[PDB]
Structures are given as C-alpha cells and as structure tokens.
Amino acid sequence: QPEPDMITIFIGTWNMGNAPPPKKITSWFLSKGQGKTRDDSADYIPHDIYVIGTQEDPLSEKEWLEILKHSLQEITSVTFKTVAIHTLWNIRIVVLAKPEHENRISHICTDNVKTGIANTLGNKGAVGVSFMFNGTSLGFVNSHLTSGSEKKLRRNQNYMNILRFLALGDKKLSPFNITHRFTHLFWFGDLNYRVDLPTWEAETIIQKIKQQQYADLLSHDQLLTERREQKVFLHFEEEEITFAPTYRFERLTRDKYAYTKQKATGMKYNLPSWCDRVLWKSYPLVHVVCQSYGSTSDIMTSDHSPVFATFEAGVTSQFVSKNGPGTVDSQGQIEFLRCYATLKTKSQTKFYLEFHSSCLESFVKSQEGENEEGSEGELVVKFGETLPKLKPIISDPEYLLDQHILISIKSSDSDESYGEGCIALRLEATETQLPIYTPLTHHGELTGHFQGEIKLQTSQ
Ligand SMILES: c1ccc(NC[C@@H]2CCNC2)nc1
C-alpha cells in the first residue's frame, strides 16, 4: 500500500452554549449549510483526520466521544480511532483518524494555556494537539478568547499568550513557538471578534444578513481589521467568509439574532458577529487548499452555529536511505551566500544564527555576524559567505526538496532568540544560487527579515 502524498482534514469549531447537542449533527461533518459547502458526491468519502474544537462544552469527554464516533460511523461506516482528547474547563479538542492511519501517527502532544490574571483567569484559554503524520508535523489549537465588542485588544493579548506558552511539537525546536513548529498549523475556536458597528445599526445589520450582503459587515469584522493592521494572527490565512454571522442566535431556531443588552449579558449588546473561525499557517510551498468553510443551518441547541472547514494538506513519507538516518549523505549540502538579517531591535549585542531542520542530525550554530547600520536606522547583521555548509542526512532530491530550514537569530550575550523564520528547500533549481527570504518574528510579532542566496546540492 503506497503512503499518501495528500490527506484531507476536517476542522470543526462549535461554542455549544453549555447545552447538550441535538440527536443529529451529521450536517457539521458533511460541510452542509451556508458558505463554501462540500459537494454531495463526496458525502460517503471519509476525511483522513477530523479535529473537533468545542467551547462552553457541557459534556464529559466520554459523552462527546460517543456522539462524535457514532456520527462519523453513520456518515462513513468507518470506526474512527481516537488520536487525542484534551479539555481545559469547558474548552475541548478531539482528534479522530481513520484506522488505516493509526501506525502513520506518532509523537502525539497535548497542552493548554489559561489566559488572563485573577479576575480574568477562570474560563478562557486554549487547548491543542500535535502529532507527526509520516514525515509531516501537524498542530491544532482550539481557543476561546475574551468576549465583548470592546475587548479586541484583550483577544490579541490572549492570542500572543497562547502562541508563547502552548507547548506542542518537537521540544528540541527550543527557539520556536507553535507558529514555526509544524508543516501545517490550524488555529480555530470562538475567537470572539465582533462586527464593530454602532449599536443603533442592529436592525440594519440583520437586514443585510437576510439579503446575504456580508461585504459592509466583513469590512468591520475585528479579526480581519486587526489582521490588516498586523495586530494579531500575522502570517496566518483564512478562507473568504460567505456564511451569515454565527453568533448570537435565539436557541431552537436560526430565524432570530438575539443582540439586545440583558442582565444575562452584563448589559452588553451582542451585534451579529463571526465569532467562530478557522485559520491556518503552513510552511512555504507546501500544498494546502481550503475545500469548505461554512456554518450549519440545522443545529440550533446553542446561541452559536457550528463552523466547518476542510483542507487538502500535502504530506511526505518517512525517508530511509543506506546513509541517513544515523549518518550524513555526503552527496547532499545546503550553502547560504550573501545572507543578512535586518532587525528592528534597538540593542547592540553580537548575533549568531541557529539552523534547525529534521533533514539535519542536529541544529547548527553559525559564527557571529557583523553588525552595520541600515540607511533608515535599522540593525543589519551581515553573514556574507561565512555561514556553515549544512549536511543533510539524506541527499535524495525527492526527500530534500520537500524539507524546510527554521532560522533563529540569537543574541551572543543572552542566547535569546530575537527572530524566527522558515526557508523552503522547494527550489526552482539545484547547484544554482537562488534568492531566499523569510520574515522574522518573535512571540509572533515582526522583528525583522532574513534574506540572501541558497545553493542546494542533491544526489541528482
Ligand atoms: C487581513 C490581513 C491580510 C489579508 N490579506 C493579505 C495576505 C498576504 C498574504 N496572504 C493574504 N487579508 C485580511
């Protein structure tokens, strides 16, 4: 049986509003309702991996696992295997996979982050799961961020705390947060960003939703506007939204948005909003295609509607040669020419690089670069032709061209990363000098750039 080069992944996010689900939730897993929906001809085809994120989930892990597995069984006639389940308070993630994948999945990690201090520590945060699927790392984060139209800055702070402190993936990648540890990272949940229009406009907003005219509402969606201004989710993607706002509904119908201030809302308005979202970030030049993004219309136990997203995701096989793993393939090398880092830091320390990749036996430390002053104020750290020659474990170009190099630029004084980025080895040519580029981030904020040239030698 050949190993796959593609898999399909289902992502669901549902704020269940502390209520048990209805008896049938199959529309969710079938990507049926409003938005970008899945073709009827695919209904019997199982996804490879189903990742279910809930918020305000009132069920025990056992109760929810039984509903999920039963649902998938009814749709597909496949008994899914549980990869992982992790719950923080009422925030939960479930990962289910087809039984044929059981021995393709390894290195399963789970973690949680609690957001806020004192007052604000008590029910918001994130859960996550990572694992390897053959040669591909996959990470999944379900977050329930701070509620309320006037707390977008809190939400952005919650996001930064989650991507700093959630401990998933390979712990040897010590300079790197979850935004660099995975071939494919999916981040979803009740992100709680709102449509930021005046309260008085509530009935007008409802009118626009009934006409399926979302453009003037999405232009005021706080997640899109905060993303635009590089305040949150830098370098993440989201598929175009073509479904009605998923919050806040009257229960047991979808005919009514419940937006008016009530004692039960802390006297806050809940204008109709896209609270419930799926975003992703994949390494450069890896195949990832969103094939559905929408909301269900027939699941009405909560004041939110479930959201679905599905993806085609490129995967690679575990590689064994006569040489690596356990030695170098002398036929392989990665050389960096004319490289320099441009940093936003005001500090004056020396910097060195670390190169991390699963194509190396272990990470590689460079010599210190030479600091110069940029024309517009900046620190430029020059490496020239001084960077070490990297010695991959396998030289086969069908392996090596699928790999990536993670780069950290570190202070010599503190050994603290000032910036992290990623370079694809999916080059237009081998044995040829070609431009390379990555932005550098730290704690998910832009801190600079790394650019230069690469020269990759493979066995071909
Ligand atoms: C908010 C922020 C950005 C954005 N598109 C630009 C990205 C550039 C790389 N892919 C899309 N859209 C909304």
From Swiss-Prot:
Tyrosine phosphorylated by the members of the SRC family after exposure to a diverse array of extracellular stimuli such as cytokines, growth factors, antibodies, chemokines, integrin ligands and hypertonic and oxidative stress. Phosphorylated upon IgG receptor FCGR2B-binding. Changing V288E: In one patient with acute myeloid leukemya; somatic mutation. It is found in: Cytoplasm; Cell membrane; Membrane raft; Cytoplasm, Cytoskeleton. It comes from the Eukaryota. Specifically expressed in immune and hematopoietic cells. Expressed in bone marrow and blood cells. Levels vary considerably within this compartment. Present in at least 74% of immature CD34+ cells, whereas within the more mature population of CD33+ cells, it is present in only 10% of cells. Present in the majority of T-cells, while it is present in a minority of B-cells (at protein level). Phosphatidylinositol (PtdIns) phosphatase that specifically hydrolyzes the 5-phosphate of phosphatidylinositol-3,4,5-trisphosphate (PtdIns(3,4,5)P3) to produce PtdIns(3,4)P2, thereby negatively regulating the PI3K (phosphoinositide 3-kinase) pathways. Able also to hydrolyzes the 5-phosphate of phosphatidylinositol-4,5-bisphosphate (PtdIns(4,5)P3) and inositol 1,3,4,5-tetrakisphosphate. Acts as a negative regulator of B-cell antigen receptor signaling. Interacts with tyrosine phosphorylated form of SHC1. Interacts with tyrosine phosphorylated form of DOK1. Interacts with tyrosine phosphorylated form of DOK3. Interacts with tyrosine phosphorylated form of SLAMF1/CD150. Interacts with PTPN11 in response to IL-3. Interacts with receptor EPOR. Interacts with receptors MS4A2/FCER1B and FCER1G. Interacts with receptors FCGR2B and FCGR3. Interacts with receptor FCGR2A, leading to regulate gene expression during the phagocytic process. Interacts with GRB2. Interacts with PLCG1. Interacts with tyrosine kinases SRC and TEC. Interacts with c-Met/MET. Belongs to the inositol 1,4,5-trisphosphate 5-phosphatase family. The SH2 domain interacts with tyrosine phosphorylated forms of proteins such as SHC1 or PTPN11/SHP-2. It competes with that of GRB2 for binding to phosphorylated SHC1 to inhibit the Ras pathway. It is also required for tyrosine phosphorylation. This is Phosphatidylinositol 3,4,5-trisphosphate 5-phosphatase 1. It comes from Homo sapiens. The chain holds residues 398 to 857 of 1189 of the full protein.
